[PDB]
């Protein structure tokens, strides 16, 4: 009618106006994928970023672990052939817990944790567990009971595997904003998604960087982390995406390495021939063995990253501990280098 | 015993395989060998839709063959008037990681979802007069890969949690769950009567589901890798699938087996999207190599190419009137071909 066309042109003008504004926000925000290998400390790093500027589910995981212990104990006693605690004192501890049944606002007292661990290592309670399947039992009973020390540590942050053993995650993707030097960063953490990543990982082809968190002190989780990094680094849709690599949990590794109890040589045989790089910058006081260990792990990742994609995308390795307040500045400095290298690429100056 | 339990599935898959081979008496290539080819199909870009900030994952034509909706991971749904290129609505999404969008056949609603695991319904004709979300469908435990309205109050979804679900939009509840796939379900296509639908998954199998009952009727194998896309033949008796194995395949519901393979040596990338023309004679497939090929569905010959995108072609769609094709790309543009 030429007036319908006129009103469709004004509606289009009003949209393209808003699209210009929204385009300003989109181009001035850096988007980050946080990909954490299992039990990597990624959640702890996230909690730190939010505090400085998923964790709340810790109480639920506790509750599940407590329910599991209560069911195993009561059910174990009421079995047709009652299982017998190896230890009468352990049984007394069990009696305490049995009294501790059905109390809301449970304090989760440290004794309770010590009490729980004692009952778990009680072979009679384990014998119940053998027949635990017979009675109704909570599915994540072994997993929670084995990880009791981690849960007891007040600083404990529920890990993704723990959130998956329970069913406390509804949201597919978790978001967290932070700001450094008035630059905006949008970091995305994968929530309820299955462990098959080859499809949903393609959504993050144009993030500024993928923050790969790896628990350095594992050994074989380190080798699993290596395979994942390799697939990410060689995927055709991620070939232009840089990777900020956080070799996390360096404190755990220093502790494990000085002890000698587990030799990285058994899991990675070539270590026995690895010499520390002649350009390594160790911490001021750490000994050569932890420096050799931490740089061998880094060189296992750099060997993958330097084998392909020299000019298109880059790997920024950082020896980190999940509670460093410098993680935010490290991300900022790598993103600056990433964007700087992109613009220099457009001008053919690199 | 799991051992014999697994061994009677070998005989049952042996029973099904010989029963499918008895049916196979002549190849579709032999039935259509003496029909004339379609000749060179040479379509041109008639519209380039500009305005999405980032890669487009999905698009869906309205039933009026004029309006369409597109979803980009900038966090925007845009409803375009394809005739004038004017944008009718710009819907800011709560979660920017959108992977699918759907246009209701009545024009009253659009749906979209993604890594948020939610199917969000948007009312386009609110009595107050502004576009706003009217329903959030939160049941899935994995990313939403595809959604299609049956009507204003019913929508089928497919998810990375290896299931499909039928939803009651009013109650927000999950009415029926379709299980049996053992991989990410990537795409679904409603039969023209909306009594059945097919789904393609990352187990290299397509499954035919009964919407009313809620069970799988038939399972179709033959693809070598993940199926990324699926589409019913216009008569509802067949469907085509596109896979990471660089192959499109046509499957017959009544013969219960593959009929034809659409493949060329020069093609080694996966298919992202497939769609038939109105008559079903042409099968249009979008590829990772930035092109869309036009296949002769009956003769398995390539009839043309839709070149002109500068990045991955993520989605295709043919109008209900068959007048035009729309392609969406990671280059953030939609093109209308004719």
């Amino acid at each position, epitope marked *: 009618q030429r007036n319908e066309e006129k009103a469709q042109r004004e509606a289009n003008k009003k949209i393209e106006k808003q699209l210009q504004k929204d385009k300003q926000v989109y181009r001035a925000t850096h988007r980050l994928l946080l990909l954490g290998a299992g039990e990597s400390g990624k959640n702890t790093i996230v909690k730190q970023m939010r505090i400085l500027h998923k964790a709340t589910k810790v109480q639920d995981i506790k509750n599940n672990l407590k329910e599991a212990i209560e069911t195993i104990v009561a059910a174990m006693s009421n079995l047709v052939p009652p299982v017998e605690l190896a230890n009468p004192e352990n049984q007394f501890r069990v009696d305490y817990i049995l009294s501790v049944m059905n109390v809301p606002d449970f304090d989760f007292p440290p004794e309770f944790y010590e009490h729980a661990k004692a009952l778990w290592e009680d072979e009679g309670v384990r014998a119940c567990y053998e027949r635990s399947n017979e009675y109704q039992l909570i599915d994540c009973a072994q997993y929670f009971l084995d990880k009791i020390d981690v849960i007891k540590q007040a600083d404990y942050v529920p890990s993704d595997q723990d959130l998956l053993r329970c069913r406390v995650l509804t949201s597919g993707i978790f978001e967290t904003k932070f700001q450094v030097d008035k630059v905006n960063f949008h970091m995305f953490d994968v929530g309820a998604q299955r462990d098959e990543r080859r499809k949903w*990982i393609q959504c993050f082809n144009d993030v500024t960087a993928i923050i790969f968190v790896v628990a350095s002190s594992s050994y074989n989780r380190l*080798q*699993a982390a290596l395979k994942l990094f390799d697939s990410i680094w060689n995927n055709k849709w991620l070939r232009d995406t840089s990777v900020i690599l956080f070799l996390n949990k360096q404190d755990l590794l220093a502790e494990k390495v000085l002890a000698g109890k587990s030799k990285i040589e058994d899991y990675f*045989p070539e270590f026995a021939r690895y010499t520390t790089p002649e350009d390594a910058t160790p911490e001021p006081g750490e000994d050569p063995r932890v420096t050799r260990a931490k740089y061998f792990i880094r060189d296992e990742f750099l060997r993958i990253s330097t084998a392909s994609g020299d000019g298109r995308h880059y790997c920024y390795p950082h020896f980190t501990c999940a509670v460093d307040t410098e993680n935010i500045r490290r991300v900022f400095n790598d993103c600056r280098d990433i964007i700087q290298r992109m613009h220099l690429r457009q001008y053919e100056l690199l | 015993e799991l051992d014999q339990l697994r061994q009677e599935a070998e005989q049952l898959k042996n029973q099904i395989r010989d029963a499918r081979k008895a049916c196979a008496d002549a190849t579709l290539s032999q039935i259509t060998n003496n029909i004339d080819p379609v000749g060179r199909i040479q379509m041109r870009t008639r519209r380039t839709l500009r305005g999405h900030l980032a890669k487009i994952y999905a698009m869906h034509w309205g039933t009026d063959s004029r309006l369409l909706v597109s979803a980009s991971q900038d966090g925007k749904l845009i409803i375009w008037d394809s005739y004038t290129t004017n944008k009718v609505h710009a819907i800011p999404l709560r979660s920017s990681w959108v992977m699918t969008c759907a246009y209701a056949p009545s024009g009253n609603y659009v749906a979209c979802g993604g890594l948020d695991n939610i199917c969000s319904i948007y009312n386009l004709k609110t009595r107050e007069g502004n576009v706003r979300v009217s329903r959030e469908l939160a049941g899935h435990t994995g990313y939403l890969s595809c959604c299609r309205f049956l009507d204003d109050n019913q929508i089928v979804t497919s998810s990375g949690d290896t299931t499909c679900a039928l939803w009651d939009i009013e109650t927000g509840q999950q009415t029926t769950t379709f299980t049996g796939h053992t991989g990410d379900v990537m795409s679904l296509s409603l039969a023209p009567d909306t009594r059945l639908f097919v789904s393609g998954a990352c187990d290299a199998s397509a499954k035919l589901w009964d919407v009313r009952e809620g069970m799988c009727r038939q399972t179709f194998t033959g693809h*070598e890798s993940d199926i990324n896309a699926i589409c019913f033949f216009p008569n509802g008796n067949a469907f085509a699938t596109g896979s990471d194995d660089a192959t499109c395949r046509l499957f017959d519901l009544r013969a219960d087996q593959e009929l034809m393979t659409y493949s060329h040596d020069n093609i080694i990338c996966g298919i992202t999207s497939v769609s038939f023309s109105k008559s079903g004679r042409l099968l249009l497939a979008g590829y990772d190599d930035f092109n869309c090929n036009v296949w002769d569905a009956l003769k398995a010959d390539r009839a043309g190419v839709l070149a002109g995108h500068d990045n991955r072609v993520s989605c295709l769609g043919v109008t209900d009137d068959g007048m035009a094709v729309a392609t969406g790309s990671w280059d953030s543009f939609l093109k209308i071909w004719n």
Partner: nanobody
Framework: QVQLQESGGGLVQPGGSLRLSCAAS????????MNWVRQAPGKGLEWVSD????????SYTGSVKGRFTISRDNAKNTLYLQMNSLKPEDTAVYYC?????????????????????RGQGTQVTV
């Protein structure tokens, strides 16, 4: 239909040898990188070894380097794992696992709990 069926395995003494096989069918074997993966009793799936399409780029997990030898016969659509110097820690179900897409260098989901392009396995007890 894509089918992987592992052959071999059984019971051996420490230091003994064993030769596993993988009969593939339902895909162009030559276009896919192949994997051996295993699941020890109690623990999760762990990658063991892989091999490129032509059989030129080979890789092994650290625990088995020097002991296991992966190989593929592209003419007969068969994958092999010659296992020498077997240790009780090698006891697991060993799975033949194909990378999900052909002509690729990224091979993501082969150790996932549920993964489609992976055989039933074969029990190896040491």
């Amino acid at each position: 239909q894509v089918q992987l069926q592992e052959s071999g395995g059984g019971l051996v003494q420490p230091g003994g040898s064993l030769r596993l096989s993988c009969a593939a069918s339902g895909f162009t074997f030559s276009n896919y990188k192949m994997n051996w993966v295993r699941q020890a009793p109690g623990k999760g799936l762990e990658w063991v070894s892989d091999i490129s399409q032509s059989g030129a780029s080979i890789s092994y997990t650290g625990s088995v380097k020097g002991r296991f030898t992966i190989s593929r016969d592209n003419a007969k659509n068969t994958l092999y794992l010659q296992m020498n110097s077997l240790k009780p820690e090698d006891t697991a179900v060993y799975y033949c696992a194909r990378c999900p897409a052909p002509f690729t260098r990224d091979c993501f989901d082969v150790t996932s709990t549920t993964y489609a392009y992976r055989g039933q396995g074969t029990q190896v007890t040491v």
